[PDB]
Amino acid sequence: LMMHSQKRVVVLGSGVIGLSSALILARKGYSVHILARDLPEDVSSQTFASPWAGANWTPFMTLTDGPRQAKWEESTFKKWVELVPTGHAMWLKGTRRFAQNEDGLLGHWYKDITPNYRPLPSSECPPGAIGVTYDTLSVHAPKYCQYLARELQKLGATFERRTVTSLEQAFDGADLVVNATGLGAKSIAGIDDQAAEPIRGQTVLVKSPCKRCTMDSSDPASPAYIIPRPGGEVICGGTYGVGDWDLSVNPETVQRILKHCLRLDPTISSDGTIEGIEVLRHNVGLRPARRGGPRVEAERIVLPLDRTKSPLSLGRGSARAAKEKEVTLVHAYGFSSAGYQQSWGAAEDVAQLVDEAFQRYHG
Amino acid sequence: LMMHSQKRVVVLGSGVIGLSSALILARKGYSVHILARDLPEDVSSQTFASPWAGANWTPFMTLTDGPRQAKWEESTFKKWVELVPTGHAMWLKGTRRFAQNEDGLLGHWYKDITPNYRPLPSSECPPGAIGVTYDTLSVHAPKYCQYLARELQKLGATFERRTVTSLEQAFDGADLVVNATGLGAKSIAGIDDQAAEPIRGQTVLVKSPCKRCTMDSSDPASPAYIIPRPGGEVICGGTYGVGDWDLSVNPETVQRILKHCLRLDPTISSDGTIEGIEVLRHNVGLRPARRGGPRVEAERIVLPLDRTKSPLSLGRGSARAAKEKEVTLVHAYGFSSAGYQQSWGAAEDVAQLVDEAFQRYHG
Ligand SMILES: [C][C]([N])[C@]1([O])=O[O@@-]23[C@@]45=[C]C([C])=C([C])[C]=C426N2=[C@@]4(C(=O)[N]C(=O)N=C4N5[C][C]([O])[C]([O])[C]([O])[C]OP([O])(=O)OP([O])(=O)O[C][C]4O[C](N5[C]=NC7=C5N=[C]N=C7[N])[C]([O])[C]4[O])[O-]2136
Ligand SMILES: [C][C]([N])[C@]1([O])=O[O@@-]23[C@@]45=[C]C([C])=C([C])[C]=C426N2=[C@@]4(C(=O)[N]C(=O)N=C4N5[C][C]([O])[C]([O])[C]([O])[C]OP([O])(=O)OP([O])(=O)O[C][C]4O[C](N5[C]=NC7=C5N=[C]N=C7[N])[C]([O])[C]4[O])[O-]2136
């Protein structure tokens, strides 16, 4: 007769959001099992977003438009500062950010977070653009997820490859699931979220000692960015193809991205020419976005599902029947272009929802 | 000092085409190694087509439009007949095929292949449609690939998971590669085929003892088909979304497919109603098609690649340089909606090209 945990949770999804959420829960003493199709070793899989990110910290919203996003970003910056000594995050000093106009600088809301924030002179911007410079942070996206997974191993979390088609498959050995499935949320019966949408991102991974980050949103016909990452490499971008599921490399996009990034910073090349860029890989990932913004909230659901709950329910629609339990589903998906930079703060909010649900519903 | 093989080949890709090609080569005494991202155990992976097929034998072209396709189909039918005794293929007796008009019956070219071919009376067709009936064959798509893989194991072929980005990575231990990469052919440097395109197919897998196949192309607003497969299950379709990469399940498509299939055959349900259909899974796969039709041909290529051969070449465009060898690349991709029904005949043509290349170029 042993004393077993009364704090079991399943995390569905093993991208940066599921991993971060799992880790804070494990630290809080929950017994965590991670169920996912794609795991941190899957460093070239296009069926999840996390391998493909820069990943730097670049706020995209005003406070009024994105209050949660700012909270989550501010919290994650603090965490990444703590990771610099051990090399899991890296300073991007003197990052340059260009916008079409003052509005695109988002009210400068993050100016107390990124050190050394200040305007750039027009001489330091693309023609007709406006700019600021500051010190930000980046992580090596696949290696950061693998780090989180090692931390999870030590805290007793376990992992299992599974592809779920209906929610009851996740409510396996726990009465609370964290839904961190990115795009998958649309096609799981009992979630069925039609608002989930991809935002396609093509990049070129380059070998370069360049440690300068440049974020250029001043040309609406050509998104571009240069994001150095731990390790001797730079990610050159990019695209933001809303609703585009295409996983193939566009060769014309390659040329546009490299020409534009070269204009922003010639040192990404050996000799300043497109031909001097040492290309390591051409990449395409689908950012998991959501019309109406990221979903971070707790829902109570009755199982089994019926066709009345979900058009995708399995079995005969004719059912209604069977055993019947109520469970808690804590959503955490739709982070779009900002899942890494929001991940720690989002995870903190997920863990708070789990604590509150446990108090109300789980004894 | 042992006598080693002088007949090494790599097959790049492990869908039905790569597997079939590998198997005929192994039978011919080649030493075959299969390199692929997705292998036959990956029965729910959306990054290749082969898990998702019906798979039945339904010619789609006239002889004049598709001479190779007909050759390949006729050969594969003979092979599948040979597989019926051991349960790897199944007769679909009294299959019904509906078309909008006589032209859609393709000149009846296959009437000596499928037993019991004859016209249907209009009373047996959707209103305004024309029809024929015949006996055809189907295989269980994922299990058929797993069968081929067991046959390959016995003949000494080996497998390795790899995702290739540039052709030299495949020319590993062999001077001849079979390129059976489906959609992947567009994004591998040294192949770069912009004509590769997906054709998206959504289906509903249903549990039903129904053994009747119905193929309905008489409604251009609603493709539909019911394909029984070994095992107690039927695949209900479908869609043909040319150029559509969307991997998510469309709930409105579910309703259209089930309503239309029910009109064609009520016995897919327990009680003849949509609600009586026992749904096992909702599926989306991308057929690997190609503008200009399937590509089955042998090319000679110099390695290393340079930026002049491929916009996606790795390293600096500035290169031209390095060791330099010529190798043989035998293409086998772009089979669209007909890769299973063409697979054996296509493999026979691949193996002939390999024999001829070996004679001319490989000693
Ligand atoms: C500049 C920037 N920002 C940009 O560009 O944007 O972006 C990214 C992405 C991409 C694609 C790119 C190209 C880039 C990048 N970069 C970054 C940065 O820098 N930063 C940040 O922050 N971010 C970013 N990004 C974005 C990201 O990536 C995102 O957001 C994330 O990753 C997201 O995450 P999550 O949410 O976690 O998601 P994922 O990863 O996708 O994962 C999912 C999961 O789940 C699973 N599943 C699904 N479904 C299912 C499942 N399982 C089971 N069953 C079912 N059914 C999967 O598998 C996984 O695990 O930028
Ligand atoms: C009625 C009919 N016909 C229709 O509907 O159409 O179709 C299919 C499909 C689908 C999707 C569906 C839904 C259905 C179905 N079905 C069938 C029938 O019935 N019959 C026939 O014949 N067919 C069919 N189908 C179609 C099929 O599926 C196809 O064609 C095939 O599968 C194709 O094959 P292949 O060519 O082999 O391809 P895949 O599978 O995709 O594979 C590929 C491979 O490769 C690899 N990769 C790529 N990339 C790469 C790689 N590796 C390495 N590296 C790189 N980069 C992959 O992974 C694999 O392995 O019907």
UniProtKB/Swiss-Prot annotation, chains A, B:
Task: Cite the binding residues for anthranilate 1.
Answer: Y225, R287, S337
Chain residues that bind anthranilate 2: F60, Y240
Give the residues the record marks as binding FAD. 14, 17, 37-38, 49-50, 54, 56, 164, 287, 336-337, 339-341
Query: Under which EC number(s) is this enzyme classified?
Result: 1.4.3.3
Q: What are the boundaries of the signal sequence?
A: 3-26
GO MF annotation terms: D-amino-acid oxidase activity; D-glutamate oxidase activity; FAD binding; glycine oxidase activity
Q: Which UniProt keywords apply?
A: FAD, Flavoprotein, Glycoprotein, Oxidoreductase, Peroxisome, Signal
Chief location of this protein within or outside the cell: other
Q: So what does mutating Q146R actually do?
A: Increases activity on D-aspartate. Increases activity at low oxygen and D-alanine concentrations. Increases activity on D-alanine. Increases activity on D-arginine
Provide the transmembrane region boundaries: none
Which consequence is recorded for altering G201D?
Increases activity on D-alanine
Q: Where, in this chain's numbering, is (R)-lactate bound?
A: Y225, Y240, R287, S337
Query: Where in or outside the cell is it found?
Result: Peroxisome matrix
The pH profile of the activity is:
Optimum pH is 8-10.
User: Which EC class does it fall in?
Assistant: oxidoreductase
**What Pfam families has UniProt attached to this entry?**
DAO (PF01266)
What's its job? Catalyzes the oxidative deamination of D-amino acids with broad substrate specificity. Enables the organism to utilize D-amino acids as a source of nutrients.
- Family in the record: Belongs to the DAMOX/DASOX family.
Q: What is this protein called?
A: D-amino-acid oxidase
